[PDB]
């Protein structure tokens, strides 16, 4: 019974504010892409149950460029960009509480509730992508070239194994920007190493920094237990610059509805988005659906890559902690 | 003392047969104590002038 | 770090630390515990890791046998707990007296 | 550190430090006591840590 641009429900003047606020409050960014090109805003227009889309490399290159002379004319030409199939996913929910949370925020949440939902989908994107990579990249024999371990009895993750894992891409360098981390690791690090609290630029305060790279703290990491005291950690290293995503759009972004027998009302969002590494291809096996797949099933097994070796671009290493 | 627990949001999925619903979660007591305090000043002219000029 | 897991469903929600003097004596003896002017405006608060610490000598203390000292040092950094004002009437009064010669203030 | 915290409640109330010459000799040998022009203007005074020394 108030201003409530949601309970007076102006769908315009609201939804774009929501999505934009989501993009530039969330991070990542960057790390990964921000405001991907019209290409993906086109193939994001509207498509259907995949598979997904293509999604070129970017560029063209070649080898050779033969010996042009009289004859043995050109040959128009060779490729090697064919698939990279991936998933299109669908999400949404209502709001948990009543109008109680909604305008409990306040009177005129033209901004407010929008900020709320925005931060929410931020965390969403975080979890889905992180668990996704973790579910796939590590477990297969196909990616092995991108993983290091050591990680038996010998190594602290300082200043050296970081060098090795950093240069496991021997051609490409200065492509490392983000760094994924488990809390305990950065504890050992801020103990020994120089990891440095730096407000970077204007504006806002602030993030941690190891070197030159902008680090990302996360809660969820696979943690094993081997006998004798050991604990092995993951903490992916990518900061590739980048991954990519495109939104698309559903029908009915936000719908204000109430109930009767009880005292409540409900807000809903249900947005679609498309995100994945390119990177490995998503096959179709051992999955129900559809679409999307799931969280778990979006992880457990069955992905397949084609490049192979370079321009993936991600690496992992399982390192012993500070013992 | 209400619990609004901020955003709360989660995932579910969009499927053929189902629909999202928000949650409730076992609303309990709320429990607090409103307290009453206040005191005097031992002051001489102490507080007023001794605290200074203005 | 263990206790930093101990927030039941939460990690990376920490904010501050409650403490007693002796522990932080061990602290700034050994470790890096940072002197931070970050928040505005003034200098400063002791900082363990990205976080304020609230120090006061008044705390609990235990005693074991062998005359050994267990310390408490609440670790919460919730963000947050809460308090709401409320108000009486007559916020501040001005009054004086006869026999003993003064004037007093009261607020409540 | 010990003498510094012999006040357990109060801290960051240490500013000046009184010193005998021989002591600061030992100190400028081992420790980092550093010569810093600090306030504006004028030059200058020794410093151990943020404290001014006398």
From Swiss-Prot, chain A:
The keyword Cell cycle does not apply. Its main location: virion. Keywords: Capsid protein, T=7 icosahedral capsid protein, Virion. Pfam families: Gp13-like. It is found in: Virion. Interacts with the scaffolding protein gp11. Interacts with the decoration protein gp12. Capsid protein self-assembles, with the help of the scaffolding protein gp11, to form an icosahedral capsid with a T=7 symmetry, about 61 nm in diameter. The capsid encapsulates the genomic DNA. This is Major capsid protein. It comes from Bacillus phage SPP1 (Bacteriophage SPP1). The lineage of its organism: Viruses, Duplodnaviria, Heunggongvirae, Uroviricota, Caudoviricetes. The gene is 13.
UniProtKB/Swiss-Prot annotation, chain C:
GO terms for cellular component: T=7 icosahedral viral capsid; viral capsid. It is found in: Virion. The keyword Zinc does not apply. Keywords: Capsid protein, T=7 icosahedral capsid protein, Virion. Its main location: virion. Capsid protein self-assembles, with the help of the scaffolding protein gp11, to form an icosahedral capsid with a T=7 symmetry, about 61 nm in diameter. The capsid encapsulates the genomic DNA. Interacts with the scaffolding protein gp11. Interacts with the decoration protein gp12. Belongs to the lambda phage major capsid protein family. This is Major capsid protein. It comes from Bacillus phage SPP1. The chain holds residues 164 to 271 of 324 of the full protein.
């Amino acid at each position: 019974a108030y201003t409530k641009i949601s309970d007076v429900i102006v769908p315009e003047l609201f939804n774009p504010y929501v999505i934009n606020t989501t993009t530039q409050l969330s991070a990542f960014f960057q790390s990964g892409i921000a405001a991907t090109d019209d290409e993906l805003n086109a193939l994001a227009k509207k498509a259907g149950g995949g598979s997904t889309l293509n999604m070129p490399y970017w560029n063209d290159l070649d080898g050779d460029s033969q010996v042009l002379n009289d004859t043995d004319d050109l040959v128009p030409q060779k490729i090697n960009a064919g698939q990279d199939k991936a998933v299109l996913i669908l999400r949404g929910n209502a709001w948990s509480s009543h109008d109680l949370a909604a305008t409990l925020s306040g009177s005129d949440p033209m901004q407010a509730i929008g900020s709320r939902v925005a931060a929410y989908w931020a965390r969403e994107m975080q979890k889905i992508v992180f668990a996704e990579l973790a579910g796939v990249f590590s477990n297969d024999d196909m990616k092995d070239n991108k993983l290091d371990i050591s990680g038996t009895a010998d190594g602290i993750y300082s200043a050296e194994t970081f060098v090795d894992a950093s240069y496991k891409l021997g051609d490409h360098e200065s492509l490392l920007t983000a760094i994924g981390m488990h809390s305990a690791t950065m504890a050992s690090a801020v103990k020994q190493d120089l990891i440095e609290f730096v407000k970077d630029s204007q504006s806002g305060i602030r993030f941690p920094t190891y070197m030159n790279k902008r680090v990302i703290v996360d809660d969820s990491m696979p943690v094993e237990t081997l006998e004798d005291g050991t604990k092995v950690f993951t903490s992916y290293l990518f900061g590739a610059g980048a991954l990519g995503y495109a939104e698309g759009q559903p029908e009915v972004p936000t719908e204000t509805a109430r109930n009767a027998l009880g005292s409540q009302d409900i807000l809903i969002n249900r947005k679609h988005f498309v995100l994945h590494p390119r990177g490995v291809k998503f096959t179709e096996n051992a999955m129900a659906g559809t679409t999307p797949t799931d969280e778990e099933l979006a992880n457990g097994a069955n992905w397949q890559r084609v490049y192979d070796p370079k321009k993936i671009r991600i690496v992992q290493f399982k390192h012993r902690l500070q013992a």
